[PDB]
Design a protein around this ligand. Structure first.
Ligand SMILES: OC[C@H]1O[C@H](O[C@H]2[C@H](O)[C@@H](O)[C@@H](O)O[C@@H]2CO)[C@H](O)[C@@H](O)[C@@H]1O
Length: 557
């Protein structure tokens, strides 16, 4: 019987505590609100060890990562409760068909301006440079906001067409990432120009922007609802308006639903539900918090209706309508981290915009960072790539909707390739074969259907026909599929591979420039199993995976 809640320092924690206090009054169990630094990164660490907060408050996008990691408990709330909050907020906090958090509030960056200093807010980004030069000649600046966090710079970047993950056919494609497109390069390019024109300074952080604006030294800032409190403290005449256009288009700011998740390890899930459902998520409760620091537009229809009266909230909503509510998938933290780095590198001059985004994009797209072993092996792992299988049909093998493993069917071609292709560089990935009777693992340059008919089913894989692969048969017989003699085209030359230990996991390493494809026995200290060398790479080449009608999954990595 206790509750520990974690919430950001930006947010109105004290207001929340007041809610905690009333909950304690009624039920006599203590509630503690803690607002620790970088709680978003800390939470997985502590929670996993068994001691983490019972309840955590953050924007929805992370929560997928948490949920996948199994740190979040599912929530059982009744149909009638669900009705009280908007269904789109619920969707934000839905992962793999399960609700993982309670939605609380909807937060969107707004353009905030000092009315006394500036009569009319800029409709366009492009006018702002002229304005700031006008303003400098009075010891003041046009615009200051946190450049360190990509949350604040994303809206401009997305304006002309930058995007994180392509959503199509009802699903986010983690591979189709638009950080490196024309639109994104255009947006970031404008910003770097502002910095090098001395209009804005690359170091400006949250505190700097906020201090400057509150002290009326800058005409504009960019921020969410939580910030309105401090500006009220400063007695500044301010408006909250729509973000300016870039290349004639709306700034598209990612929209967050502040959400309350329940630690999977919490002994007090039962208490947590009531607190959230019956105490916080009520007119009384949100008011408490909102009076401390503004929540934005709340999820609770009851109270939000009274909030919509505030013109500032309307402005928040207008910017949200122009933007996109964040994805909640696990890759969001890669996205963010990559963009965080690209922004500062470009603004500090340590990289060109075009570099920064190619860096950031490959980082997100392929090179995901998601001893006592063979040195070559550890070397190869340095180049490790994330791989998802591409569904192209039919081969009769089943693939998990995660696109990360494949097995056969009970009911003769079952063979599958990696979604992404290879034309340059070094790629490493691992495949879990454990507990499988048979399989073929290797690098496949394509089905090459119509190239010549046969290989798919009669299982002749020969480098000459573009298959560099090794195989398991009958539980303990391992083979390399080297290419055969001229007359014998149909059958591959099969070489007994001597493996001392059945590998539960195998590592495939492609150095495209080298024309080398190497196989490592992860189970057995990463020793080399086989290496195809001097192999013709005339074509893009993809990872190959064949269950070999095993009926047991081959999982990637
Ligand atoms: O900056 C990357 C960051 O963006 C979002 O964080 C926001 C948060 O949603 C707001 O509520 C407020 O506190 O500002 C934050 C940025 O300073 C994402 O929610 C977060 O996961 C991501 O790291």
């Amino acid at each position: 019987g206790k509750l520990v809640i974690w919430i950001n320092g930006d947010k109105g924690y004290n207001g929340l505590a007041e809610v905690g206090k009333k909950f304690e009054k009624d039920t006599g169990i203590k509630v503690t609100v803690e607002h620790p630094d970088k709680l978003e990164e800390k939470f997985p660490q502590v929670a996993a060890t068994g001691d983490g907060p019972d309840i955590i408050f953050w924007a929805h996008d992370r929560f997928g990562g948490y949920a996948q990691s199994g740190l979040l408990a599912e929530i059982t709330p009744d149909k009638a409760f669900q009705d009280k909050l908007y269904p789109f907020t619920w969707d934000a906090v839905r992962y793999n068909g399960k609700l993982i958090a309670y939605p609380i509030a909807v937060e969107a960056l707004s353009l905030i301006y000092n009315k006394d200093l500036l009569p009319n807010p800029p409709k366009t980004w492009e006018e702002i440079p002229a304005l700031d030069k006008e303003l400098k000649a009075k010891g003041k600046s046009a615009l200051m906001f946190n450049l360190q966090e990509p949350y604040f710079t994303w809206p401009l970047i997305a304006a002309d067409g930058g995007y994180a993950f392509k959503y199509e056919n009802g699903k986010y494609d983690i591979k189709d990432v638009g950080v490196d497109n024309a639109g994104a390069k255009a947006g970031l390019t404008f910003l770097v120009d502002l910095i090098k024109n001395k209009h804005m300074n690359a170091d400006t952080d949250y505190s700097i922007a906020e201090a400057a604006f509150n002290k009326g030294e800058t005409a504009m800032t960019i921020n969410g609802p939580w910030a309105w409190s401090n500006i009220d403290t400063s007695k500044v005449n301010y408006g909250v308006t729509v973000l300016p256009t870039f290349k004639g288009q709306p700034s598209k700011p990612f929209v967050g639903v502040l959400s309350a998740g329940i630690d999977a390890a919490s002994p007090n899930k039962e208490l947590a539900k009531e607190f959230l459902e019956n105490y916080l998520l009520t007119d009384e409760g949100l008011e408490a918090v909102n009076k401390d620091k503004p929540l934005g537009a709340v999820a609770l229809k009851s109270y939000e209706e009274e909030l919509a009266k505030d013109p500032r909230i309307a402005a928040t909503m207008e910017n949200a309508q122009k933007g996109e509510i964040m994805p909640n998938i696990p890759q969001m933290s890669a996205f963010w981290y990559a963009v965080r780095t690209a922004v500062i590198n470009a603004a500090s001059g340590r990289q060109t915009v075009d570099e920064a985004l190619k860096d950031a994009q490959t980082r997100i797209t392929r090179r995901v960072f998601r001893l006592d072993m063979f040195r070559e092996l550890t070397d190869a792992r340095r180049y490790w790539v994330d791989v998802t299988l591409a569904t192209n049909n039919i081969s009769h093998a089943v693939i998990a909707e995660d696109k990360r493993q494949v097995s056969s069917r009970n009911p003769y071609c079952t063979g599958v390739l990696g979604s992404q292709s290879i034309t340059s560089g070094k790629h490493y990935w691992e495949v879990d074969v454990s507990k499988k009777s048979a399989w073929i693992l290797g690098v496949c340059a394509g089905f090459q259907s119509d190239a010549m008919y046969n290989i798919e089913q009669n299982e002749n894989y020969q480098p000459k026909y573009g298959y560099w692969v090794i195989g398991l048969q009958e539980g303990v017989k391992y083979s390399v599929f080297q290419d055969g003699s001229s007359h014998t085209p149909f059958a591959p030359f099969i070489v007994p591979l001597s493996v001392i230990i059945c590998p539960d996991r195998v590592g495939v390493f492609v150095d495209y420039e080298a024309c080398t494809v190497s196989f490592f026995n992860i189970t057995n200290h990463g020793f080399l199993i086989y290496k195809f060398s001097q192999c013709s790479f005339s074509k893009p080449v993809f990872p190959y995976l064949n269950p070999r009608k095993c009926t047991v999954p081959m999982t990637l990595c």
